[PDB]
Amino acid sequence: LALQAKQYGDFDRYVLALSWQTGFCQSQHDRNRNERDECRLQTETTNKADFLTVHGLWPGLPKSVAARGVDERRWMRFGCATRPIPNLPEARASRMCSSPETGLSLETAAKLSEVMPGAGGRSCLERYEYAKHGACFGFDPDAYFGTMVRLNQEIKESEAGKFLADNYGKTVSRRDFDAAFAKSWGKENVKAVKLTCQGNPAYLTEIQISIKADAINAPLSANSFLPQPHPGNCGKTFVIDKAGY
């Protein structure tokens, strides 16, 4: 089912946010944070690429919102909660479950759980994510979360996901990662990716990909991406963290 905005739909992109699950857990641990049930339960699996989980799908700054004075950073920080508009209740990471239940169908909830360990349960990551990046757009939750799942799978199945899989636990260079990405989607789209790392030596924690708003309901190709200015804080070499602290 197609993902369509009903309000503030005049934005040009979506940032698919994927996290290297193992790395994510590794960081929460090293920062001395409380271990979540998703990390405490985290365990080794057959397809290493499956460690690439869904974090979210974030629409870019809507022109109609920018027109009212909202800037890129404010948008990145508050999303649907920016003022003067859309001005919806702020979604807080410290109380994700306090955000409104999305209305996601049981079927889509199950598909999401398989790839978004933080969804539902006592985390409620999907409520936080929808309140911040979807509610103000009137997105059908099913089409919204259903699209994240699809995109995550296509990524995992491309040379990008395979790259991660083959270098599981190894140190890689941003250069080769870029070649892996460019291999499936073109050299010119390498700048659509922002990588996030933690620690020193740096290890991967998240992958952010800029996708054209107009190409969101189609299988990814070399015309689905938009370059963006932030390479990330990973440096030219980083580690594809393995499961376990």
Segment near Ca ion (CB under 5 A); pick from 34-42, 60-68, 162-170, 233-241: 233-241
By the rule CB under 5 A, 82 interacts with Ca ion:
no
Minimum distance from residue 195 beta carbon to Ca ion (Å) = 17
Nearer to Ca ion, 142 or 241 (CB): 241
Among 208, 196, 99, which Cα is nearest to 155's?
208
By the rule CB under 5 A, 241 interacts with Ca ion:
yes
Determine which residue in the list 19, 21, 26, 42 makes contact with Ca ion, applying CB under 5 A. Answer: 26
Segment near Ca ion (CB under 5 A); pick from 1-9, 22-30, 167-175, 227-235: 22-30
Q: Tokens 């659509």 map to which residue? A: 192
By the rule CB under 5 A, 129 interacts with Ca ion:
no
Separation CA 127–CA 141 (nearest Å): 10
Minimum distance from residue 126 beta carbon to Ca ion (Å) = 25
- Distances, alpha carbon 83 to alpha carbons 11, 53, 108, in Å: 17, 31, 31
Q: What are phi and psi of 125, to 5 degrees?
A: -55, -35
- Distances, alpha carbon 93 to alpha carbons 15, 161, 182, in Å: 19, 28, 34
- For the annotated catalytic residues, the residue numbers are 55, 129, 133
Nearer to Ca ion, 98 or 171 (CB): 171
Residues in CB range of 9: below 8 A, 6 or more apart: 62, 137
Segment near Ca ion (CB under 5 A); pick from 18-26, 48-56, 139-147, 213-221: 18-26
Residues in CB range of 43: below 8 A, 6 or more apart: 243
- Which residues of this protein are in contact with Ca ion, per CB under 5 A? 22, 26, 241
